[PDB]
Amino acid sequence: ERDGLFCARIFGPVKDYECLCGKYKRLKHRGVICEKCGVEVTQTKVRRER
RNA sequence: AGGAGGACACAAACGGCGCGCG
DNA sequence: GTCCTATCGATCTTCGGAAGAGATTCAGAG
DNA sequence: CTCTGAATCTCTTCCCGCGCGCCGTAGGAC
Ligand SMILES: [Zn+2]
């Protein structure tokens, strides 16, 4: 759930390299910001550091 | 006649309680 | 049945630790 | 009247692995 303790756009996406909203599923769109959910697509590991 | 035209990737978790062994 | 909110917001959470160390109070003490 | 004594307060601590095995949100409102 967004804006929660596990918000995707706050801490990071859950999928390996895919955004939560599913707009992008490739390294070709790595680093871009989606506007279907607001989550930033990057390496999911960053989710443990933000 | 002549002549003309014509989908890749991907293998199980975190805290108690109890027991037991070194 | 589902999904909810809230968590002794009318109790009594255990009495079979020891100690060791500070920290905090008190007590004649001038 | 506080000072510099004790005395009485709370807090911290307690070997290493290893296996079994269970056991693990709750009551209330639409
Ligand atoms: Zn997305």
UniProtKB/Swiss-Prot annotation:
Top-rank taxon: Bacteria
Sites where the protein binds Zn(2+) 1: 19, 21, 34, 37
Coiled-coil parts of chain: none
Family, as annotated: Belongs to the RNA polymerase beta' chain family.
Self-association state and partner proteins as the record states: The RNAP catalytic core consists of 2 alpha, 1 beta, 1 beta' and 1 omega subunit. When a sigma factor is associated with the core the holoenzyme is formed, which can initiate transcription.
Chain's role: DNA-dependent RNA polymerase catalyzes the transcription of DNA into RNA using the four ribonucleoside triphosphates as substrates.
Protein name (record): DNA-directed RNA polymerase subunit beta'
